[PDB]
Structure 1
Amino acid sequence: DAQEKLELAEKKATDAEADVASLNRRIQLVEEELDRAQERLATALQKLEEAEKAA
């Protein structure tokens, strides 16, 4: 039982770590996409200022 629990805890660690890595990938993807949304936002806001300023 300790050994199976170990294989399962190791599996859980494997999966938790797979999830750490898969999420780290995803967190980074949302951080990168966030930076892009923020850059696009700064761009949209600058364009908004240009359009609004044109107006």
Structure 2
Amino acid sequence: SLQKKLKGTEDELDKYSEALKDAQEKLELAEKKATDAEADVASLNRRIQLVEEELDRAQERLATALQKLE
């Protein structure tokens, strides 16, 4: 009876180990997607801000050029 009880608990530990390994790999993939997405949004935020500041400068250049042209 004790051997039968041991073998069932060992099979349960192997099943939980298999589930834990699966969860750990999917955790790692979720973390890798999160760090890549965080880096890409931060990099694109710098680029859109740079383009937006250049648009504000281009509008100022246009406004002074039209005033001098008139």
Asked whether the two chains share a fold, i.e. TM above 0.5, the reply is yes
Which residue of structure 2 lines up, in the alignment, with residue 47 of structure 1?
68
CA RMSD between the two structures: 1.6
TM superposition score normalised by structure 2 = 0.55
Provide the identity percentage. 100
Classify 1:25/1:2 alpha carbon distance in 2 versus 1 (closer, same or farther; 3 Å).
same
User: How many pairs does the alignment contain?
Assistant: 48
Structure 1 segments unaligned to the other structure (5+ residues)? 49-55
Closer/same/farther in 2, CA of residues 18 and 39 from structure 1, 3 Å limit = same
Q: Per-residue deviation at 1:44?
A: 2.1
Structure 1 runs (4+) greater than 6 angstroms displaced: none
Structure 2, unmatched stretches of 5+, are 1-21
How far, CA to CA, are the matches of 1:4 and 1:43 in structure 2? Answer: 59
Deviations 1:4-53 (A, max 9, x none): 232222121111111111011011101111111111121222233xxxxx
TM-score, length of structure 1 as denominator length: 0.66
